[PDB]
Design a protein around this ligand. Structure first.
Ligand code: VS5
Length: 133
């Protein structure tokens, strides 16, 4: 029942500062502009200990499956090859990606009827709000 309140299909409804987050991460111009238009779906499911998070969009479909606390390989939407670890901390899913000596942290939180996602790279934070689809 670890992630019960996260399970579902979630659609992006708002984004703030995501272009600047992407710049800080190192995403190139064309990817930033195209990615910035999209309203992706985030589809979260759980089977035993395995959590699956799918992202479906006009740009890219991708998917991660993982066990909390257990590092895995991830290809990001902007084509970074990262080493990811996702944990639960006080009911927040905390996702750390490591690549090329860099690190970014992505938090997913249930707040009211929304899923609030905060992405941080150095001093830049972005907030993306998703609603049930
Ligand atoms: F069409 C799309 C598809 C994917 C993304 C996208 C990107 C990146 N990180 C993301 N997430 C945010 C939610 C939590 C995980 C990190 C997304 C995303 N937004 N919604 N789902 N995934 C990194 C940079 O490249 C794009 C943006 C537009």
């Amino acid at each position: 029942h670890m992630c019960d309140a996260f399970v579902g299909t979630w659609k992006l409804v708002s984004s703030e500062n995501f272009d600047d987050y992407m710049k800080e991460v190192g995403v190139g111009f064309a990817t930033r502009k195209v990615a910035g238009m999209a309203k992706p779906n985030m589809i979260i499911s759980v089977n035993g200990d395995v959590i699956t998070i799918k992202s479906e969009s006009t740009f890219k479909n991708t998917e991660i499956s993982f066990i909390l606390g257990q590092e895995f390989d991830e290809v990001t939407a902007d084509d970074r090859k990262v080493k990811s670890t996702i944990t639960l901390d006080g009911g927040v899913l905390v996702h750390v990606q490591k690549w090329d000596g860099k690190s970014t942290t992505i938090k997913r939180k249930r707040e009211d009827d929304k899923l609030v996602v905060e992405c941080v790279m150095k001093g830049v934070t972005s907030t993306r709000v998703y609603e049930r689809a």
